[PDB]
Ligand binder design. Structure first.
Ligand SMILES: *[C@](=O)([C]([C][C][C][N]C([N])=[N])[N]C(=O)[C]N1C(=O)C([N][C]C2=[C][C]=[C][C]=[C]2)=[C]N=C1S[C])C1=N[C]=[C]S1
Length: 237
């Protein structure tokens, strides 16, 4: 995350850090707990990933330093990628990770509610993007989970900033006209939480953008509310 600040421990209990053991263990992407056995993340985060066996999900983490060889984690039983996904910039950048075991909720790890179709009209004014991603290009994974408050921008305005792409209604953008605060490499799959009426909603999933925090280049996110039916279908045993 760029132009962000250190998060408070337990402040984003649905935020998880997704790790890969190949070749050696490291943070791969962010993700969000949406069910006792489900993580919602980005699809493009599984490029080159041929087996869920090399994945490790860590919940209730503030600092990457807390993660050691002993540290407990959640295995991944199945990776579910939207069948229409091709690449982040084309949309459908969403995936579900079915965990091998169930998450026991607590103050440090709990699920975030999904947006309601009737909320597609709601005006989110308190939105935050979080992650251990780059604080700048050519940077590196950060130790402490970062947070940044960023305003949502209309799809019309976003389309103007990406004339080379098609910003669909299945995407949602966020950023400052002057740039300065945004998600970056490593934040992918992360949640774009928006508190409405005392309740936090998973409005978006960190997906892509041109560079990071550049002026007139809003971050682009998967518009989660457009996938509630998909999520229900894929999670209902
Ligand atoms: C993800 O953490 C990053 C997050 C990027 C967020 N960017 C913001 N908010 N400024 N996602 C990606 O790397 C996805 N991605 C891209 O963002 C780009 N950008 C180049 C581009 C896009 C549009 C127009 C011009 C240029 C290119 N490819 C990809 S696919 C990986 C990470 N995911 C994996 C590692 S870090």
């Amino acid at each position: 995350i760029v132009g962000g600040t250190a998060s408070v421990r337990g402040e984003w209990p649905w935020q998880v850090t997704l790790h890969t053991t190949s070749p050696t263990q490291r943070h791969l992407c962010g993700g969000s707990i949406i069910g006792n056995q489900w993580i919602l993340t980005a699809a493009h985060c599984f490029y080159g990933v041929e087996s869920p066996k090399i994945l490790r999900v860590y919940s209730g983490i503030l600092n990457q330093a807390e993660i050691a060889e002993d540290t407990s984690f959640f295995g991944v039983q199945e990776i579910i990628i939207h069948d229409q996904y091709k690449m982040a910039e084309s949309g459908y950048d969403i995936a579900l990770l079915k965990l091998e075991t169930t998450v026991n909720y607590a103050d440090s790890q709990r699920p975030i509610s999904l947006p309601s179709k009737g909320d597609r009209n709601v005006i989110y004014t308190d939105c935050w993007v979080t992650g251990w991603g780059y604080r700048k290009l050519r940077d590196k994974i950060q130790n402490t989970l970062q947070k940044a408050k960023i305003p949502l921008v209309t799809n019309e305005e976003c389309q103007k900033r990406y004339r080379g792409h098609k910003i669909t209604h299945k995407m949602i953008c966020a950023g400052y006209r002057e740039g300065g605060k945004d998600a970056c490499k490593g934040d992918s799959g992360g949640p774009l939480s928006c508190k409405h009426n005392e309740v936090w909603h998973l409005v978006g999933i960190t997906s892509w953008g041109e560079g990071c925090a550049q002026r007139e280049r809003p971050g682009v996110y998967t518009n989660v509310v457009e996938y509630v039916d998909w999520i229900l279908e894929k999670t209902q045993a």
